[PDB]
């Protein structure tokens, strides 16, 4: 387990401090337990990728991204409540303030690693209209970006990404919840005769 991570670091040439953050995130309990709040259905989800319980604040905002990451192959690991980052940013007045922030997820992929924060539509618009230098929209890639999060990512060899709920395909979510029971199984062996029967019926009729 450690050798593969070491080869990952060597291949991507992550700095000593970046490797320190990745190691800390890998071996640490989540910073805060998800609270019920007043408007968010919270809870925990079992993930066979990590093989542990991962906590989501919102079952329709962060949880879809968690489902993607669990069924995504590009993702190696996805920790929740990574240690706080002291994001430094200048407000509208001009004062450079440092605010502690906890990203929703920390995702380590097969070619990069970093932070991923899940938000909604109206939250992103109010935060952008109330903080010009903390969030903005790039219509080229059609993505929301946070200046201090991506700055901290770029000072550490990591990435920063904001996952909204505009880009999530809900049909994909429904089908993942449909086939999760078969995904959690480990020895799916269909009878050869029955599989051949369905293969014949499928190849004899397209678009069935």
């Amino acid at each position: 387990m450690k050798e593969q991570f070491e080869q990952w670091v060597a291949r991507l040439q992550i700095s000593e401090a970046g490797q320190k953050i990745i190691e800390k995130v890998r071996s640490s309990e989540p910073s805060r337990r998800v609270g019920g709040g007043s408007k968010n259905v919270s809870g925990r989800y079992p993930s066979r990728k990590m093989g542990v319980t991962i906590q989501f604040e919102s079952h329709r905002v962060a949880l879809p991204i968690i489902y993607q990451l669990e069924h995504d192959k590009d993702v190696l690991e996805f920790y929740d409540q990574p240690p706080q980052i002291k994001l430094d940013y200048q407000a509208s007045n001009g004062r450079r303030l440092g605010v502690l922030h906890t990203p929703d997820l920390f995702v380590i992929r097969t070619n990069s690693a970093g932070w991923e924060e899940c938000k909604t539509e109206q939250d992103l618009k109010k935060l952008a209209e109330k903080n010009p230098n903390r969030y903005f929209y790039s219509e080229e890639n059609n993505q929301w970006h946070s200046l201090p999060g991506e700055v901290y990512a770029n000072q550490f060899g990591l990435y920063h990404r904001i996952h909204s709920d505009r880009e999530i395909n809900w049909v994909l979510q429904r089908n993942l919840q449909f086939l999760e029971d078969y995904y959690r199984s480990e020895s799916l062996v269909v009878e050869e005769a029955i599989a051949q029967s369905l293969l014949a019926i499928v190849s004899s009729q397209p678009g069935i």
Binding site: E29, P30, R33, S47, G51, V52, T53, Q81
Partner: peptide, 15 residues
């Protein structure tokens, strides 16, 4: 807080 479980990352699966 008070009466709240520590944020432990619970293992899954049947042993």
């Amino acid at each position: 807080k008070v009466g709240k479980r520590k944020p432990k990352r619970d293992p899954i699966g049947v042993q």
